[PDB]
Scaffold this active site. Structure first.
Site: not given
Ligand SMILES: [Mg+2]
Ligand SMILES: [Zn+2]
Ligand SMILES: [Zn+2]
Ligand SMILES: [Mg+2]
Ligand SMILES: [Zn+2]
Ligand SMILES: [Zn+2]
Lengths: 440, 440
Positions: B43, B94, B145, B147, B158, B314, B319-320, B323, B361-362, B404
């Site tokens: 992610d 996501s 979450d 994903t 979500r 995953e 990602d987390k 952030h 994912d991005h 992102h």
């Molecule tokens: Mg995710």
């Molecule tokens: Zn993501």
């Molecule tokens: Zn994110």
């Protein structure tokens, strides 16, 4: 093509593929020799830069008919070295990176055509010429700038444009101290068949030693048999370029003017200022050849050599406008490069023995961010081809030059030996790929 | 092996290629059916994230034995849509991105398993199960979450983790209003053979309607025949997983703990604080399974089905931690994913009929920048495997969550039908590639 095939809101409508690709990719794989190579470099054109320009000019689901059309793709690494320690330096400049693909040896930031010990290594262009191939070096930058200079000059600092800077900054290379000379002097010795770009300013300098001591470097070029041209009409009238009459085009005092106009990004620009539409730059006169026009002329003249040719083409001001935090300038120079890539691919598909490669020297600052972003650096909103807003952000420098980044980035290729860009590679592998393709 | 050849200061010493790749790439191309698919998602794992983690953990000239070892590579686009207009939204979340590869339709940010008209579309996991294949869903995140949830839940936001949030934020989906229920309720209905991750917290909520009204969602799972496990020992004891006895592993209250600790990046952190060396997280112990361990157990249990299996894995906290502007956390989660990719590739090479795909994912915020950078955002210097300093920058948000970014990014594959990731593709093409590979 690889555009979205229909209605992006419907199932399957954003697909870029129409069917299974296995047979088409098998057909793309050839290990026959390359007769010719065309290497196109977007300076600072990372994946982020490609995506931003596509989104703006073609729409999110659009397709660059040049840049996006090369079927064999991978990601490469472009780290430089620390001169003193020999350890990696994770963020390269244009000089160390261009040295890597043109010689196959890593070096320190600011070095051209030399290693960390200041020793010269031969370039792919020098090697092509020694094998009897025609050679071209085309850029929208001043010709002394790092990316074109690395093919033809060996100096310990990229600042050594002419005699004046070389005596101060590269005393080992200075002609009057027994060196090979300034960047411009070494370019004139290298005698590529076709050299096209900016950088007329340094040609007003005089040499400090040698056969042409006291003459300007322009006078030297004339005395040594070069055809000098300065605008589109004079370029178009050139009907041959070879070792007896090499072509040198000098189309601006410094860098050539960019294609598109817009304002600089600003603090909270996406929030506090209106969204921008890019427009044609009025300060670029029609008498200045475009990158695609320079590419077309180079191909026409070089392809007369029946043994083959090597040509490098640089979209130089993608990077320069990214440093200046100017989205319209940056995107317009990416669109400009795509036009030149189309000319190269059209030629290569007809000829059948030409390897075409499109990549960048390193990644850069710009990021695509959400429309309501509140960022600490410089931002701008843009009105894209889709009729929606895209925001770009430049967040890595408090000084007025946004900086390079170290991320690996796309390399793509078409034609003989193109398999050698797939997967993870290094920028120095590109030297060896080109050497083997041409059998040098 | 795509590590640097040897002495990176010497000619050819940074090469990753040992010879011509054309024959080996031809051998990598098969259009025979895939029996199994293993899809691994990092992610937020853009090219920048891969490069930073490689530079730190493996060295600049190193090689991820999992992530970097897939031979067929391309770049894909992951833009979402504006719900109202249907035009592109250039920076996805996501939820919209996971919906795109699992269903083949673009959607709006925050949607799971529904299009811009809020219509449900079947997911690749639901389709695999309907065709008689085994199914797995593995993540280091809470299982509610975006994903993992996209494979098994169809909700308009979500945020709808359990009954409470669904009644407030997705009234149309709330069980007591005639909808299909919360994410956790829909996950229990979907009944994958193997589901492993975090997110025990939401299972303490009680249902508001239906057969299991007034019971906790954990009690519901028990009553419906699930095998519930909570640690490495209980996971390892499991001998079978199928529709009679489906497996549900809940290994943390929320997200599973990260592998490596270091401090948050700060304003001028690369200037004002010493370089950081990561250290292991004491919260990790032999009782919490690793991502690689969860992956291996899933493969063992799913491979009993003689028709085949679909498995998504995953690495969620890349990602987390991006952030959170935490380089050590981000990098350690990328190293964690690489171990799971190695397990998947080892299995696939032996079995011979398994397509393995690794992507993100991005893209995300982090950038690799020069050591002397003076940036307006958050920065940190790190001591890498090479014994040199790397600096990372987070420059796109004045709030405490770095955001992102929209850049296209690497997708790589191994095995039957892997040709379909080469060149420029869209995230929705990945749905169609997987569907066709399994002959669904
Ligand atoms: Mg995710
Ligand atoms: Zn993501
Ligand atoms: Zn994110
Ligand atoms: Mg350049
Ligand atoms: Zn550059
Ligand atoms: Zn630059």
């Amino acid at each position: 093509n690889r555009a979205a095939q229909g209605d992006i809101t419907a199932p399957g409508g954003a697909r870029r593929l129409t069917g299974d690709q296995t047979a088409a990719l098998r057909d793309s794989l050839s290990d026959k020799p390359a007769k010719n190579i065309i290497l196109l470099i977007g300076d600072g054109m990372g994946d982020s830069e490609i995506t931003a320009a596509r989104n703006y000019a073609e729409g999110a689901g659009g397709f660059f008919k040049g840049i996006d059309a090369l079927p064999l793709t991978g990601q490469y690494t472009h780290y430089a070295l620390n001169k003193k320690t020999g350890k990696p330096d994770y963020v390269t400049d244009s000089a160390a990176s261009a040295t890597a693909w043109s010689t196959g040896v890593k070096t320190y930031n600011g070095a051209l055509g030399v290693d960390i010990h200041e020793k010269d290594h031969p370039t792919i262009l020098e090697m092509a010429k020694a094998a009897g191939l025609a050679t071209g070096n085309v850029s929208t930058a001043e010709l002394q700038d790092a990316t074109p200079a690395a093919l033809v000059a060996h100096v310990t600092s990229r600042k050594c444009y002419g005699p004046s800077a070389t005596s101060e900054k590269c005393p080992g290379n200075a002609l009057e101290k027994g060196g090979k000379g300034s960047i411009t002097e070494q370019l004139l010795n290298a005698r590529a068949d076709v050299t096209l770009g900016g950088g007329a300013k340094t040609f007003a300098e005089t040499a400090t030693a040698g056969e042409w001591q006291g003459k300007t470097l322009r006078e030297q070029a004339q005395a040594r048999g070069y055809q000098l041209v300065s605008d589109a009409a004079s370029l178009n009238s050139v009907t041959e370029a070879n070792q007896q009459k090499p072509l040198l085009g000098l189309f601006a005092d410094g860098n050539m003017p960019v294609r598109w106009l817009g304002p600089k990004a600003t603090y909270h620009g996406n929030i506090d200022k209106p969204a921008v539409t890019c427009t044609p730059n009025p300060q670029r006169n029609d008498s200045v050849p475009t990158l695609a026009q320079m590419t077309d002329k180079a191909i026409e003249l070089l392809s007369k050599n029946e043994k083959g040719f090597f040509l490098q083409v640089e979209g130089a001001s993608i990077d320069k406008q990214d440093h200046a935090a100017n989205p319209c300038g940056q995107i317009g120079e990416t669109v400009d490069l795509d036009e030149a890539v189309q000319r190269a691919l059209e030629f290569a598909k007809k000829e059948g023995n030409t390897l075409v490669i499109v990549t960048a020297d390193h990644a850069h600052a710009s990021q695509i961010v959400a429309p309501d972003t509140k960022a600490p650096g410089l931002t701008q909103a843009l009105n894209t081809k889709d009729g929606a807003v895209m925001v770009m952000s430049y967040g890595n420098s408090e000084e007025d030059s946004q900086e390079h980044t170290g991320s690996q980035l796309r390399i793509a290729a078409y034609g003989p030996h193109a398999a050698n860009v797939v997967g993870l590679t290094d920028q120095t592998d590109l030297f060896y790929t080109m050497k083997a393709a041409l059998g040098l």
